[PDB]
Amino acid sequence: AIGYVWNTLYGWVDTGTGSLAAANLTARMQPISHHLAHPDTKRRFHELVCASGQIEHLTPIAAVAATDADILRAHSAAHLENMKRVSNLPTGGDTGDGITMMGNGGLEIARLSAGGAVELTRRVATGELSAGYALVNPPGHHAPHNAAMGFCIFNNTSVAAGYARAVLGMERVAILDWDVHHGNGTQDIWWNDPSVLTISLHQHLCFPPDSGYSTERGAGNGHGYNINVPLPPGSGNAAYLHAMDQVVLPALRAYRPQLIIVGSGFDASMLDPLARMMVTADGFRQMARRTIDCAADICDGRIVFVQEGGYSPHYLPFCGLAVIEELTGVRSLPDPYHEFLAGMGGNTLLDAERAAIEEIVPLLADI
Numbered sequence: 403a404i405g406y407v408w409n410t411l412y413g414w415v416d417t418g419t420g421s422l423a424a425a426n427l428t429a430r431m432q433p434i435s436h437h438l439a440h441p442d443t444k445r446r447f448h449e450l451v452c453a454s455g456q457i458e459h460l461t462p463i464a465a466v467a468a469t470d471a472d473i474l475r476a477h478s479a480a481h482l483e484n485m486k487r488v489s490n491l492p493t494g495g496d497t498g499d500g501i502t503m504m505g506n507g508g509l510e511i512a513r514l515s516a517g518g519a520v521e522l523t524r525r526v527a528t529g530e531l532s533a534g535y536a537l538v539n540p541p542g543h544h545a546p547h548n549a550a551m552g553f554c555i556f557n558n559t560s561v562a563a564g565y566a567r568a569v570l571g572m573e574r575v576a577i578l579d580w581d582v583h584h585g586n587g588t589q590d591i592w593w594n595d596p597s598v599l600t601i602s603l604h605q606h607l608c609f610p611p612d613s614g615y616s617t618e619r620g621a622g623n624g625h626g627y628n629i630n631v632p633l634p635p636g637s638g639n640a641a642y643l644h645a646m647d648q649v650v651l652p653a654l655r656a657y658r659p660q661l662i663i664v665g666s667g668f669d670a671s672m673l674d675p676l677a678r679m680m681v682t683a684d685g686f687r688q689m690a691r692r693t694i695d696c697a698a699d700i701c702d703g704r705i706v707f708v709q710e711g712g713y714s715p716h717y718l719p720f721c722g723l724a725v726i727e728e729l730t731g732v733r734s735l736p737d738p739y740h741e742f743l744a745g746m747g748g749n750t751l752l753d754a755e756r757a758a759i760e761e762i763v764p765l766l767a768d769i
């Protein structure tokens with residue numbers, strides 16, 4: 403039984419009229435219909451889940467709006483109050499960083515995004531479902547305890563982990579973030595806390611420009627329980643799989659989480675505008691397969707995927723579908739881009755990629 407969350411409102415997120423920041427006439431930044439983070443990319447993934455017939459092998463789970471209490475397990479009261487303020491504006495507004503628009507009433511959608519993660523987690527942890535995929539929007543992993551950042555309003559995977567900890571009574575949860583950008587928000591939230599192992603694979607200094615170094619290991623009781631794996635631009639399937647086998651899977655095995663939450667972004671894809679990585683749908687497939695098999699071995703299969711970034715409306719749907727196919731074990735479609743992208747490379751481990759990953763292996767000893 404594989405759960406699947408989509409809510410119509412995930413596709414209604416108002417990203418405004420700019421490309422990244424707001425349109426600005428003096429800067430001569432012309433308005434544009436689709437911001438880089440426009441919801442159509444993720445809606446096209448949902449629609450392919452349905453049109454491919456994959457949906458027939460999934461258990462649809464309705465998102466439930468995250469309550470203030472749910473949000474407050476991950477976030478400060480001032481942050482929540484600030485999001486209520488912006489949401490109430492007649493056209494919404496930027497939430498602080500200059501690139502994170504929330505539309506009017508957009509707090510409703512942020513609540514449903516975090517609540518989609520929580521509701522899936524609840525049903526997987528109870529044993530009602532074996533695993534699932536929450537195709538939420540807006541994304542979460544850049545939002546630290548006290549701010550929105552990098553298109554993220556609330557940290558969905560941390561709201562879910564907080565729920566699993568405080569409500570479900572789980573003692574150890576792992577959040578594995580393979581969105582191409584550093585999960586700085588997740589890192590922040592659990593910085594001092596060994597009860598949530600936070601792992602981020604990312605393009606080094608892609609976003610944020612100042613975090614994600616492997617020296618960022620957590621603090622106090624949390625020291626050794628944050629692991630960053632920064633990778634060079636141009637890394638593809640071979641690098642990502644080398645990181646999975648050499649660092650991620652051993653880290654999870656050492657930690658023995660009771661639940662694995664995957665921050666599942668697809669912006670490491672070969673065709674993504676917001677990073678320079680070379681992962682293809684098959685790469686994501688192999689990453690999902692490895693992680694799911696690890697969950698089966700160490701935590702009774704309890705694994706929940708939660709959508710983070712990804713900015714190719716053309717290709718992201720196939721990358722996403724590949725992961726969902728690994729969850730259901732039922733294949734619906736080939737990746738029609740397979741051959742086209744295969745010729746471009748990324749499928750050979752380069753020495754600089756190997757060196758970046760091997761830097762992290764010594765940190766495993768402290769888990």
Ligand SMILES: [K+]
Pocket residue numbers: 592593594595596597598599600620624627628
């Ligand atoms: K931690």
Ligand SMILES: [K+]
Pocket residue numbers: 579580581582583584585602603604
């Ligand atoms: K990441």
Ligand SMILES: [Zn+2]
Pocket residue numbers: 581582583667669710711712
């Ligand atoms: Zn991202």
